[PDB]
Design a protein around this ligand. Structure first.
Ligand SMILES: C[C@H](NC(=O)c1cccc(CNC2=NCCN2)c1)c1cccc(Cl)c1
Length: 299
């Protein structure tokens, strides 16, 4: 069992936090918020670094390029923005969605960005030109998550429509459809499994190749929000998620037992992230709290 303990509380957002993500090189945590801002914090000392601004409405997600130099953000202003982290400058505004942009990610090469929107579509964008390469008529309700697999050859998407779909990146064709709203999905680090959250207080681990559910994780509260969940791999092999009872939940991936619940937040824990090399979790909460917490474990 891990022993995550609170190390830092990061204050500065003035509305709900939406998404926190560690840079791939481990140096930084980026946060996005309903306050229209991205903030950058030191991953190991929690020290506030800078605010990145330019969206006209709140931000629901942020993601890093593989070299840790760029961010992309998804906003209620119906755009994504690509940012140079060092300069804080908006390099490109990605225009095309017809409703809020809710989720985003770079591919491993980081030449592409995938987005999902309240407009029910998934879009694939060229980072260099800032132009949309493909629009996938992916779902029949808002798209809650989008994620590339380990080499970027596949995209997984999820939606309030109750479906999780897997797409061939190069062609845009749907390869597989895996019905409560699906509120989050993500490939496992090796690309073989998909972790999927549904709004009936349940997470499930699916075998992509077999299209079969292998594990179910329960005990947390998730009936309303699209809460980020994670595979923790730096120490023990855990599943980590936020929860609507204001706690971070950690489960043993294989046995499905809850191994720790992290207390301290005073609103829904909407986002968790796991550090790429250290046993460090970042968590963030909605507008009664507005803070990010950094936790550390010895395993
Ligand atoms: C009402 C609810 N809204 C949210 O869950 C919400 C609001 C602000 C910030 C975030 C975290 N952003 C995020 N989670 C995954 C990718 N980006 C989530 C909702 C429910 C079902 C489907 C949808 Cl689309 C929306």
């Amino acid at each position: 069992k891990p022993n995550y303990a609170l190390k830092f509380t990061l204050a500065g957002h003035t509305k709900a936090v939406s998404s926190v993500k560690f840079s791939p090189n481990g140096e930084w945590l980026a946060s996005s918020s309903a306050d229209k801002l991205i903030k950058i914090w030191g991953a190991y000392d929690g020290k506030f670094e800078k605010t990145i601004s330019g969206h006209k409405l709140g931000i629901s997600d942020v993601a890093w390029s593989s070299d840790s130099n760029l961010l992309v953000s998804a906003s209620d202003d119906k755009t994504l923005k690509i940012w140079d982290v060092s300069s804080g400058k908006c390099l490109k505004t990605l225009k095309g969605h017809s409703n809020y942009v809710f989720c985003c990610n770079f591919n491993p090469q980081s030449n592409l960005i995938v987005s999902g929107s309240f407009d029910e579509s998934v879009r694939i964008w060229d980072v260099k030109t800032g132009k949309c390469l493909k629009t996938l008529p992916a779902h029949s309700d808002p798209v809650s998550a989008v994620h590339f697999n380990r080499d970027g050859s596949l995209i997984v998407s999820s939606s309030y429509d109750g479906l999780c779909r897997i797409w061939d990146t190069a062609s845009g064709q749907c390869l597989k459809t895996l019905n409560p709203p699906v509120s989050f999905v993500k490939f496992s680090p090796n690309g073989k499994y998909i972790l999927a959250a549904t709004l009936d207080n349940t997470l499930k681990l699916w075998d992509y190749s077999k299209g079969k559910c292998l594990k179910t994780y329960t005990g947390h509260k998730n009936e309303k929000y699209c809460i980020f969940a994670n595979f923790s791999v730096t120490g023990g092999k855990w599943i980590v998620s936020g929860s609507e009872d204001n706690l971070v939940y950690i489960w043993n991936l294989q046995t499905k037992e809850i191994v720790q619940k992290l207390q301290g937040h005073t609103d829904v824990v909407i986002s968790t992230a796991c550090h790429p090399t250290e046993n460090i979790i970042a968590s963030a909460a909605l507008e009664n709290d507005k803070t990010i917490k950094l936790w550390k474990s010895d395993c």
